[PDB]
Amino acid sequence: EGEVTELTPCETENPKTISHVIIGLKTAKGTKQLKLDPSIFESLQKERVEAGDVIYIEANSGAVKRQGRCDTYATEFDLEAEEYVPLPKGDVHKKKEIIQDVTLHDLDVANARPQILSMMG
Amino acid sequence: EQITLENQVHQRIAELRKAGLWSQRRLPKLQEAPRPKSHWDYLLEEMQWMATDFA
Amino acid sequence: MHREVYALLYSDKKDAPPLLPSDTGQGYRTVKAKLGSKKVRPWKWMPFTNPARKDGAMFFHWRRAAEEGKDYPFARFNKTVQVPVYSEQEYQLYLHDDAWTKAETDHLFDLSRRFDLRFVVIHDRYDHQQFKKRSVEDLKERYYHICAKLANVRALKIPVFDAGHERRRKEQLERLYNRTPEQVAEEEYLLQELRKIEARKKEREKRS
Amino acid sequence: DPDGPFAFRRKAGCQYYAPHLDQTGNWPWTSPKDGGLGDVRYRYCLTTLTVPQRCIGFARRRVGRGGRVLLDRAHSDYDSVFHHLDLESKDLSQILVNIKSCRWRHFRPRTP
Amino acid sequence: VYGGDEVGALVFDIGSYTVRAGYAGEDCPKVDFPTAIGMVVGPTYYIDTNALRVPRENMEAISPLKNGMVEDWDSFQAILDHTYKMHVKSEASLHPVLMSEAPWNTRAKREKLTELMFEHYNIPAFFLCKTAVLTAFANGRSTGLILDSGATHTTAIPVHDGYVLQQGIVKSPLAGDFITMQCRELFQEMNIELVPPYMIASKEAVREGSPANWKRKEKLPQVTRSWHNYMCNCVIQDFQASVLQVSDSTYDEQVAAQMPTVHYEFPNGYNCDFGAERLKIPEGLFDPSNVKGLSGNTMLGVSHVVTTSVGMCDIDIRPGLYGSVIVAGGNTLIQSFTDRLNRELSQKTPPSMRLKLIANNTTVERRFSSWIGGSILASLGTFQQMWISKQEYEEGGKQCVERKCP
Amino acid sequence: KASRLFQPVQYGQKPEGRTV
Amino acid sequence: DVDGQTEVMPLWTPPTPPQDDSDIYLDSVMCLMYEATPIPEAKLPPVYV
Ligand SMILES: Nc1ncnc2c1ncn2[C@@H]1O[C@H](COP(=O)(O)OP(=O)(O)OP(=O)(O)O)[C@@H](O)[C@H]1O
Ligand SMILES: [Mg+2]
């Protein structure tokens, strides 16, 4: 996760062809460049990621998710709420552990009735 | 042997102390009369601070 | 590894540069309004009186216009070591010593006032050519004796000087310094041998 | 008797300073582990900044000539670990254990 | 109260090799021109590098300083005037001046220098500090043993609380001039013809040891022997800086021969490998008993000079002297000189006292240390009380320098 | 622009709103 | 620290002006051979005679 600073594709000759997509991510700790798979270009345009946008990318799927403009670009004169987010703290690359406590009955209720059929339910 | 070594080293230490060469029993230093810091002391402190700033 | 680092000028040639504070670091554009809202105070090249100087000479400073004519702050540092002053009569009455000439005592006190009682500097600057040769202990003894006598005559109490102890201390230090490398090696060998003997004794006592 | 040639004899109205025996003395601007006085004005300690939010390593606050407060920095072999250090592998584990036990003084800025 | 105040004072450090000058508060001297000046039979003086390096008929090379002290006051006035007009570009009466002086400067010479600075230059304030004190101040040390190896003398000066312990000064004649003489003797033994660069019109590359194929400049005017000797000394000093190296331990012929050679090319195109002879020359600074000059002489090695100087001081101050050893002077820049000195001192220092050499092994920190300390001292706000004002020189007279400047 | 209507204020002085 | 006590980072400022004679001088060279604290009277040997 970090603020996007560059989205430069890496052109190449095929053995315009791109072999990598370099994304530069900035956090309060520093900046990192990632040599992402070229296929991520579809998700970047789907999420409309632009320079100065805070994003996070999960290691497994490689799909990008956009979480708003960095608050360093927010002025006091423009009105938006969800589209601004503070610059991520910590290292650009993070390993997070999430521990959740559930009961077998919680799983039973969850799988018995998942949340137009939803509207009627 | 150990008793002889102990007696020998004790006599050697006593002889060195008689000579004064025993640094483990150095005499203390008489405390000079206390005085406040003078102009030159403050000048040297400022000198040290400025030299650090320069480097 | 080290917990903390200590150094005077800098710790090592590989030291990172110091961080200086500055605005505009994040770009001029973001701080444009802050810098533009204010105006700087005027600075002047102005003469300043230093009350620590007895002549009254006027040097020049870079200072704000509002600070003109203010007392020099560094003059507060100006304070000398308190050294008594005695008249010819007081010396003849109390400070007379067959071992010390009056002119010699006045020279010693002048050096003491010049060098803030730094008796090593006084000894280095002592005029051994004109007056008799004096050791630093003799200078300290004479100074402290005169100060005690003048205080007792005029007025509290001060600790007395012990010239003999200082002489013995310096003699012992010189003897410890002049010893050959073999003698100091023998001293350290005796230290380590005594430590190993005591260690064996302590081990035997612990076993018992 | 053996001490007698250089024996210590206290005198009334006198005070004395004990000699250094355990460790050889050193200048004030040197660590107490090296026999120095360890004067706190010369000490370099780990410091964290607000911008960037990264520990810069060992630093000491020093006022500059024009009153500008400067952060002097001391080189250390573990500088990369100190850069990664924030919010409190073998060397990293030992450093983390030492910091969590608060054996290292690590300053952080706060508003007054 | 605050940071040191800058009063626009000047700092002059006139050494036997180069005259260092600048403005107080700077971290480096703004000028350093050779102390040797050209003289034409007051006499016409050529002082800076631009004028010294061009041949002139009946122009002699002289120096105002002798044994670290100024002897010819006319050339001293000429050098000061040149410094002001060309480099300072400011009126002398507008800036206070702080000058360095040799630890062994005489009272009469100090009085004459003060009289000159006040009567002739009409300066507003003056101060005269010792080179050792300034060297100590540049390193933030108030006490320590200064070890200066310039061009004229190698001197160890013990400083305590910012005061030179004159009784502890030990001086040796082994310095840059001795090394220059040794290199001259080595070149003479090897039959290397020293051709100064001013005589060379053009040159062609030649193999090692091959005769020099160079063309002499035409229409060259007659030059005095002093100027030719000065140019030869300059090229020899360049050789000293580029080739010479101090052995890391006691000189051994086998160990010196095993180490790789260094190749040097003379101005006339002559080139050779100096083998082990490059190591023998700097050893004379440490073991003068082996020097071809006089084996039975009484000269003391740099480490012996160090140990002797400290040995003359109060033993209460010797821990401070050994705990802060400050090396200065251009002659100490010779490769591995600091390492060899540290090794020898650690071997000779008593184990009961800590020995520490300050890490200042750079050209700027070694040559200009006195100027750096002078700038620091002149920039202190607390030092503004120490200045000798013109009014003080008027009332107290020429003798006022004896009491104001310790 | 603010500078066209208002005096800038000297450092260390309280803004009051003096115009050109 | 672990006890909740707070320490402010030292700032190496230029020397402060003296308010009184409390700024007692310290010999930095003496402190190389002897401790900076006077020996307590409890461990000081008795007066000679
Ligand atoms: N890098 C170097 N390597 C070897 N020698 C050098 C180097 N730099 C300078 N020197 C020599 O240092 C010598 C002394 O120069 P320095 O600038 O220290 O003298 P100084 O302090 O002005 O004079 P002095 O002490 O003799 O009055 C000169 O003879 C010069 O050739
Ligand atoms: Mg020199």
mmCIF file of N, CA and C and ligand atoms in Angstrom, chain E residues 13-20 35 65 68 148-153 175-177 180 237-238 240-242 328-335 363 366-368, ligand 1:
data_model
loop_
_atom_site.group_PDB
_atom_site.id
_atom_site.type_symbol
_atom_site.label_atom_id
_atom_site.label_comp_id
_atom_site.label_asym_id
_atom_site.label_seq_id
_atom_site.Cartn_x
_atom_site.Cartn_y
_atom_site.Cartn_z
ATOM 1 N N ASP E 13 46.896 33.998 8.901
ATOM 2 C CA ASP E 13 47.790 32.935 9.358
ATOM 3 C C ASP E 13 48.942 32.888 8.362
ATOM 4 N N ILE E 14 49.995 33.641 8.654
ATOM 5 C CA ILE E 14 51.131 33.801 7.757
ATOM 6 C C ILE E 14 52.196 32.790 8.167
ATOM 7 N N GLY E 15 52.248 31.669 7.451
ATOM 8 C CA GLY E 15 53.233 30.642 7.700
ATOM 9 C C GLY E 15 54.424 30.772 6.765
ATOM 10 N N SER E 16 55.430 29.933 7.013
ATOM 11 C CA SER E 16 56.631 29.958 6.189
ATOM 12 C C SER E 16 56.398 29.390 4.797
ATOM 13 N N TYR E 17 55.385 28.545 4.620
ATOM 14 C CA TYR E 17 55.119 27.949 3.317
ATOM 15 C C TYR E 17 54.075 28.729 2.525
ATOM 16 N N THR E 18 52.919 28.998 3.127
ATOM 17 C CA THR E 18 51.857 29.746 2.472
ATOM 18 C C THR E 18 51.214 30.702 3.464
ATOM 19 N N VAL E 19 50.749 31.834 2.948
ATOM 20 C CA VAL E 19 50.056 32.838 3.745
ATOM 21 C C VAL E 19 48.560 32.560 3.651
ATOM 22 N N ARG E 20 47.958 32.156 4.764
ATOM 23 C CA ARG E 20 46.536 31.849 4.820
ATOM 24 C C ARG E 20 45.779 33.032 5.404
ATOM 25 N N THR E 35 54.517 31.895 0.654
ATOM 26 C CA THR E 35 55.162 32.922 1.464
ATOM 27 C C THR E 35 56.388 33.498 0.770
ATOM 28 N N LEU E 65 59.680 35.398 6.706
ATOM 29 C CA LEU E 65 59.749 34.642 7.947
ATOM 30 C C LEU E 65 61.063 33.880 8.043
ATOM 31 N N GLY E 68 60.302 30.484 11.686
ATOM 32 C CA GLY E 68 58.941 30.680 12.137
ATOM 33 C C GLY E 68 58.610 32.076 12.607
ATOM 34 N N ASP E 148 52.911 19.929 15.348
ATOM 35 C CA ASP E 148 52.959 20.666 14.096
ATOM 36 C C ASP E 148 54.252 20.337 13.369
ATOM 37 N N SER E 149 54.128 19.919 12.112
ATOM 38 C CA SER E 149 55.272 19.606 11.259
ATOM 39 C C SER E 149 55.088 20.419 9.984
ATOM 40 N N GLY E 150 55.587 21.650 10.001
ATOM 41 C CA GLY E 150 55.467 22.530 8.859
ATOM 42 C C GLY E 150 56.645 22.413 7.919
ATOM 43 N N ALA E 151 57.064 23.537 7.345
ATOM 44 C CA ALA E 151 58.229 23.552 6.473
ATOM 45 C C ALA E 151 59.517 23.865 7.219
ATOM 46 N N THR E 152 59.438 24.627 8.307
ATOM 47 C CA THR E 152 60.619 25.078 9.030
ATOM 48 C C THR E 152 60.970 24.201 10.223
ATOM 49 N N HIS E 153 59.989 23.809 11.033
ATOM 50 C CA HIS E 153 60.256 23.029 12.230
ATOM 51 C C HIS E 153 59.145 22.016 12.454
ATOM 52 N N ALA E 175 61.747 18.821 9.073
ATOM 53 C CA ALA E 175 60.465 19.318 8.599
ATOM 54 C C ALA E 175 60.442 19.190 7.079
ATOM 55 N N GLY E 176 59.519 19.909 6.438
ATOM 56 C CA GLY E 176 59.397 19.831 4.992
ATOM 57 C C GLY E 176 60.680 20.182 4.265
ATOM 58 N N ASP E 177 61.434 21.149 4.791
ATOM 59 C CA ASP E 177 62.687 21.531 4.147
ATOM 60 C C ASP E 177 63.706 20.400 4.200
ATOM 61 N N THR E 180 62.708 17.947 1.566
ATOM 62 C CA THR E 180 63.091 18.490 0.268
ATOM 63 C C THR E 180 64.580 18.296 0.015
ATOM 64 N N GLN E 237 58.728 19.412 -3.903
ATOM 65 C CA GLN E 237 57.590 19.290 -3.000
ATOM 66 C C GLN E 237 56.433 18.563 -3.667
ATOM 67 N N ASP E 238 56.252 18.771 -4.972
ATOM 68 C CA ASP E 238 55.251 17.996 -5.698
ATOM 69 C C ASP E 238 55.599 16.514 -5.677
ATOM 70 N N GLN E 240 57.352 15.038 -3.341
ATOM 71 C CA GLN E 240 57.125 14.604 -1.966
ATOM 72 C C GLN E 240 55.662 14.260 -1.748
ATOM 73 N N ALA E 241 54.771 15.129 -2.217
ATOM 74 C CA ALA E 241 53.345 14.894 -2.035
ATOM 75 C C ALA E 241 52.873 13.676 -2.819
ATOM 76 N N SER E 242 53.428 13.453 -4.008
ATOM 77 C CA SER E 242 52.897 12.403 -4.868
ATOM 78 C C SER E 242 53.487 11.017 -4.629
ATOM 79 N N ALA E 328 49.083 18.311 13.134
ATOM 80 C CA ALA E 328 48.850 19.391 12.192
ATOM 81 C C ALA E 328 50.115 19.620 11.382
ATOM 82 N N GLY E 329 49.993 20.452 10.364
ATOM 83 C CA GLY E 329 51.107 20.768 9.497
ATOM 84 C C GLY E 329 51.079 19.959 8.215
ATOM 85 N N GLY E 330 51.545 20.583 7.133
ATOM 86 C CA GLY E 330 51.504 19.936 5.835
ATOM 87 C C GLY E 330 52.386 18.709 5.728
ATOM 88 N N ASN E 331 53.520 18.702 6.429
ATOM 89 C CA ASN E 331 54.436 17.570 6.343
ATOM 90 C C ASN E 331 53.836 16.290 6.910
ATOM 91 N N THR E 332 52.756 16.389 7.682
ATOM 92 C CA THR E 332 52.115 15.206 8.238
ATOM 93 C C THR E 332 51.183 14.521 7.251
ATOM 94 N N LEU E 333 50.959 15.113 6.081
ATOM 95 C CA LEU E 333 50.100 14.516 5.069
ATOM 96 C C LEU E 333 50.761 13.356 4.338
ATOM 97 N N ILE E 334 52.074 13.170 4.506
ATOM 98 C CA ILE E 334 52.764 12.029 3.917
ATOM 99 C C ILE E 334 52.009 10.749 4.250
ATOM 100 N N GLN E 335 51.864 9.880 3.251
ATOM 101 C CA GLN E 335 51.072 8.667 3.407
ATOM 102 C C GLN E 335 51.547 7.837 4.593
ATOM 103 N N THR E 363 43.832 17.312 3.943
ATOM 104 C CA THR E 363 44.685 18.453 3.621
ATOM 105 C C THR E 363 44.176 19.738 4.261
ATOM 106 N N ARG E 366 44.475 19.619 8.145
ATOM 107 C CA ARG E 366 45.851 19.598 8.624
ATOM 108 C C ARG E 366 46.576 20.915 8.370
ATOM 109 N N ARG E 367 46.445 21.476 7.166
ATOM 110 C CA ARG E 367 47.192 22.687 6.841
ATOM 111 C C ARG E 367 46.556 23.943 7.427
ATOM 112 N N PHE E 368 45.229 24.020 7.444
ATOM 113 C CA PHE E 368 44.528 25.242 7.817
ATOM 114 C C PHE E 368 43.962 25.205 9.230
HETATM 115 N N1 LIG H 1 49.970 16.338 0.641
HETATM 116 C C1 LIG H 1 51.207 16.630 1.056
HETATM 117 N N2 LIG H 1 52.122 15.636 1.103
HETATM 118 C C2 LIG H 1 53.359 15.921 1.517
HETATM 119 N N3 LIG H 1 53.860 17.093 1.912
HETATM 120 C C3 LIG H 1 52.935 18.056 1.859
HETATM 121 C C4 LIG H 1 51.618 17.918 1.450
HETATM 122 N N4 LIG H 1 50.952 19.132 1.521
HETATM 123 C C5 LIG H 1 51.865 19.960 1.964
HETATM 124 N N5 LIG H 1 53.093 19.385 2.166
HETATM 125 C C6 LIG H 1 54.293 20.037 2.675
HETATM 126 O O1 LIG H 1 53.984 20.584 3.928
HETATM 127 C C7 LIG H 1 55.049 21.502 4.231
HETATM 128 C C8 LIG H 1 54.574 22.466 5.288
HETATM 129 O O2 LIG H 1 53.373 23.117 4.825
HETATM 130 P P1 LIG H 1 52.448 23.927 5.813
HETATM 131 O O3 LIG H 1 51.327 24.528 5.063
HETATM 132 O O4 LIG H 1 52.031 22.982 6.938
HETATM 133 O O5 LIG H 1 53.410 25.020 6.441
HETATM 134 P P2 LIG H 1 53.257 26.300 7.374
HETATM 135 O O6 LIG H 1 52.497 25.985 8.598
HETATM 136 O O7 LIG H 1 52.689 27.427 6.516
HETATM 137 O O8 LIG H 1 54.766 26.648 7.709
HETATM 138 P P3 LIG H 1 55.794 26.554 8.928
HETATM 139 O O9 LIG H 1 55.206 25.755 10.039
HETATM 140 O O10 LIG H 1 57.048 25.924 8.328
HETATM 141 O O11 LIG H 1 56.055 28.009 9.322
HETATM 142 C C9 LIG H 1 55.448 22.127 2.891
HETATM 143 O O12 LIG H 1 56.861 22.075 2.737
HETATM 144 C C10 LIG H 1 54.752 21.235 1.843
HETATM 145 O O13 LIG H 1 55.608 20.865 0.767
#
